[PDB]
Amino acid sequence: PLSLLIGLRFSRGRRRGGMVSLISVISTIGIALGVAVLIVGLSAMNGFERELNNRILAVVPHGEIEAVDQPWTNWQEALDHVQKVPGIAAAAPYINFTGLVESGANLRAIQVKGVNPQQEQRLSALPSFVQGDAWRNFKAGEQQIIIGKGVADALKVKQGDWVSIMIPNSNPEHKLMQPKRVRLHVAGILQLSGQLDHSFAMIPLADAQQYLDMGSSVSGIALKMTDVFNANKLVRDAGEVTNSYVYIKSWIGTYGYMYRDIQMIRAIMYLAMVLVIGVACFNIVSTLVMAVKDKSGDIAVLRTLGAKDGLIRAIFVWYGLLAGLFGSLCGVIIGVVVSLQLTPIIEWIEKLIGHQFLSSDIYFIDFLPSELHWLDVFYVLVTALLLSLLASWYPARRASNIDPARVLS
Amino acid sequence: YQPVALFIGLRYMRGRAADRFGRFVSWLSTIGITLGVMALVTVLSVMNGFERELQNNILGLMPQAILSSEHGSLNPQQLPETAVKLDGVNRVAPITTGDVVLQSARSVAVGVMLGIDPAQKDPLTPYLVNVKQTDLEPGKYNVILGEQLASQLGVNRGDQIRVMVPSASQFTPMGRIPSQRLFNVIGTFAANSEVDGYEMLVNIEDASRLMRYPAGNITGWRLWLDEPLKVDSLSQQKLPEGSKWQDWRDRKGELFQAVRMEKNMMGLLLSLIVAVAAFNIITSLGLMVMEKQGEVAILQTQGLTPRQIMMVFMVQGASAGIIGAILGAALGALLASQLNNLMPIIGVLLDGAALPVAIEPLQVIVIALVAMAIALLSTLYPSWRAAATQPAEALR
C-alpha cells in the first residue's frame, strides 16, 4: 500500500493483554452503539415516510374544491377545466354528508362520502386497502355502504349487515322535522391506518344524490396530484381556473405536521447521535494521545531517518481514522442486521415487555416500520469518519512537533 | 481527618501546564458528561414544557377527575361536598358530563356536554366570547359551543341544535329513542385547543334533567388536581363509601401515555450520550493508570493499601463525574428558559410560543444522580484492576 502503513502496525501492535486492548474494545463499543442506533433511527423514519406515502397520502384527496354558496351547478365544466391543469394526475366529484350511523342499539355520528367507484379508483389507491369486498357488485342504486374498520368494530357489525342511517335534510319549510332514516347494506371493511378508518364511510354518489333528492350536482371536487409536496399553490392555481367563490383546501394543511414531525425527529436523531459519536471521538482522542506518549520513541526513530513534519501527523491521523473505521463498521453491521428484522425485534420486545408502543390511535401506524436506504448508511459512516478525523487531527499535530530527546534532556 | 487518597486523586486531575493538552485530555470525560447532561436537561425541560402546554390546553379545560356513585347518578344530599376531601385535590365543583350527538340544520357532530352551575367559574369561562356565564339559566336550555364545534355544526348565536344522548335511550316497539332536547346557542368559546372541538357548556339543571336523572341529582363532582399526571397514584387512595373515581385516562389517557412514552424515549435517546460518556471514563482510567502505574508502584512501597489505591482512582473518576453532572445541570438550567430569547434572532418555525420550558428540579436532580451513579459504576472496574495489579507484572 502507501508508506503510511506504519499506522496499521501501530494499531495491531498490541501486547500485555488487558486494559490496553479493552480500551479499543470500549471505543469500538461506543462508536458502534452510536452509529448503529443512528442508522436504526434513520431507517425507521424512512419506513415511517414510506408508510405515510402508502397508507395515508395515497388514499386521501390531495386537493379539495368545495362550493360555499350553492352545490356545484356546473361541476362538469369545472372538472374538465381542472383535469387538464398540469401537475394534476386525476380528479373526481364527491358529495360530503354527515349523519347518524346506527346498528345493534349502537349509534355514532360519522361523515359519509359519496363518490363514483370507477372514478375514485383512478383518484386514489383507497379501494386497494379494503380488507374484502365485491369490487364488481359495488355500484349505485343498491343501498350499499362501506364502513371503516374502527366504525365497524365500534358498532359491533360485520360484512353483509343492515345498518340504519339518519340524515337531517333540513329545509326552511316544515320538512326539516322527521329526519330521513334510510337503510343500507354493509359490503366492505376499510383498513387504512391508526386514525383514518375511524372516520371514512362511503356510499355511491348516485345513491347520495337519490338520498337527498337533489339534482345532478355534487358537494365538491377531489383532486390527485402528481407531486404532492407543493400542493398548496398547485390547488390554488387549479381553483383559480374555476369560479373564485369556491373554497380550496389542501391535504398539506391537514397532514404537513406529519412531514415536519418526521423531519424534526430525523434531525434530532442526527444531532444527538453526532453528539454520541463526538463522545466516542473523545475516547479516540484519549487513545491517540496515549499512543503518541507510548510511541514517542518510534516516531523519533522515524524522524531521525528523514521523516517529514507531516508524515508522523499522517500516521496518527490514519491511526485514529482506522480506529474509527473499526467501530463504524462494527456498528454498521448491527445497523443492517437490525432495520431489516426491526419489526420482528419490536414484536419480540412487545412479547417480553407487555406494553404496546405505536398503537392507541394517536399515531398513524400501529406497528413500527423499517426501510434501509444505503445512502443514509453512507451519510452516517461519512459523519463518523469525519468526526474521527476531527478528533485525530490535533493529537497528530501534537505528535508532529515533539522530539523526546529535546524535551527529556 | 479526610482520607489521604483524596489529596492524591484531586492532585492528579491537575498539572501538565507545560503543554496545556494533557489536562484537556483528562477533562474530556467531564466535558462529555457535561454535554450529555446539558442535552438531557434542556430537551427534557422542552418536552416537559410541551406536555405542560398539553396539560393546560387539553386537561386544563376538561374535567381532571370525576367522583361519582357506583350505581346510577350521584345524590348531592347523600354525599355532600364538605365531606369530599382528598390529597392533591385543590377544588371540587358539582358537574354532569355526558357524551352527546348534536344535530343542526346544516350538519351533525359528536361532542361532550358539561352541565355546570353558572355561579362557579370554570377554566372555560375566561374564553367565552359575547356570552355571559350567568346567562345559562335553568329551563332556558342554554348551550355554549366551542368555536371549532360550532364551525363543524355550522350554527351561531340564536340558532337551535338538537342534543341527544343515546346512553339514556328508551326501548319501545318503535326502536330505541335516545333522549333529545333542543338547545339555544348564545355564543362561542374561543380557546384554540382540542377541547374546544367537542366540549360544550350547559346549565347543570338542564343537563341533569336531560339524562333522565331524578330532579336535583348530578353526575358527579369534578375534582381539580395540582398534579393530575400522577392521577394513577391518586387512583389508589381511599374513597368515600359507595363512590367510584374516574379520570381523564378514560378519554385522553392513551394520547398522554404516548406523550410520556415519547418523553421517556427522547429520554433514553439522549441518555445514551452520558452512557457513552461513562464508557469514556473507563478509557481515561485505562490510560491514566497505564500513564501513572510507575507512580502507583511508589505509592505501593509506602503504606497505601491496594483498597486505598482503588479509592484514589475511584475518587478521581467520581470527581470527574460529579463535576460534569453538576456543571451540565447548571448550564442546562441556564440554557433552558432562555431558548425563547435565542430563537427570535433566527428563523422561527413554530407559531405563538417559541419553546415551552418547564424545568422540574426533581427531574434534574434525579438525572444528575443517575449520571453520577453510572460514572461510579464505570470507574469501579479500572480502579479495581489498578489496585489488584502489581507494577512488576505490567512492567516485566
Binding site: 383546501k249 405536521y257 394517536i362 | 402546554e53 398539553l54 384554540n192 372541538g197 415519547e262
Partner: peptide, 14 residues
C-alpha cells in the same frame, strides 16, 4: 402526541 399542540384550525380556507 407531544407537539399535538399544533394549531388545530390553521386552514383559513381561501
Amino acid at each position: 402526541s407531544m407537539l399535538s399542540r399544533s394549531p388545530v384550525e390553521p386552514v383559513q380556507s381561501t
